[PDB]
């Protein structure tokens, strides 16, 4: 039970940074697609 | 045990996908940040 809770929390965070990264990098896509096109 | 195995497999999936995103998009930073500034 303890280990499954801990691993669940790691899923939580890794998903969160995945979201933030994909977001800032969609922003990178937009800005740099403009700045070359 | 089945639940921990399932969730752990999902952990590896997230890790690999997040690594791929980080790589492609660090490359995007490198390339187009050089083409801009």
């Amino acid at each position, epitope marked *: 039970e303890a280990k499954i809770a*801990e691993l669940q929390a*790691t899923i*939580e965070r890794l998903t969160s940074e995945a979201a933030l990264a994909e977001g800032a990098l969609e922003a990178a896509r937009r800005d740099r697609s403009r700045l070359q096109m | 045990e089945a639940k921990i195995a399932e969730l752990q497999a999902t*952990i590896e999936r997230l890790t690999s996908e*997040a*690594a791929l995103a980080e790589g492609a998009l*660090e*490359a995007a*930073r490198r390339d187009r940040s050089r083409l801009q500034m």
Partner: nanobody, 97 residues
Framework: LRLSCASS????????MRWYRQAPGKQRGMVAV???????NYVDSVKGRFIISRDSAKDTVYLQMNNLKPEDTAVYSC?????????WGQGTQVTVS
């Protein structure tokens, strides 16, 4: 060409941990990933280059520099994740060549 960190406690009671590379004049960047499983992967730039290994005994993780081209020159900082938290140290730098 070989670099490590030590945690406060509970190695392998510590789930996902990874390392990050700070090239100067640039923002943060992930390097390589060990898990509690020993399941492992790298980022595309350092793929094949770097190798990472966990020692369950002495509360630690390992990164070993390999066949480095100076371009990787940067300041590195070792990271960890614990019940949904960041955990960052002081980090250390690597040089040209």
């Amino acid at each position: 060409l070989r670099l490590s960190c030590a945690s406060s406690r509970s190695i392998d009671g510590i789930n996902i941990m990874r390392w990050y590379r700070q090239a100067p004049g640039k923002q943060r960047g992930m390097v390589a990933v060990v898990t509690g499983w020993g399941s492992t992967n790298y980022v595309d730039s350092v793929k094949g280059r770097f190798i990472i290994s966990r020692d369950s005994a002495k509360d630690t993780v390992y990164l070993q520099m390999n066949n480095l081209k100076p371009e990787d020159t940067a300041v590195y900082s070792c990271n960890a994740i614990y019940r949904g938290s960041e955990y960052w140290g002081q980090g250390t730098q690597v040089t040209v060549s």
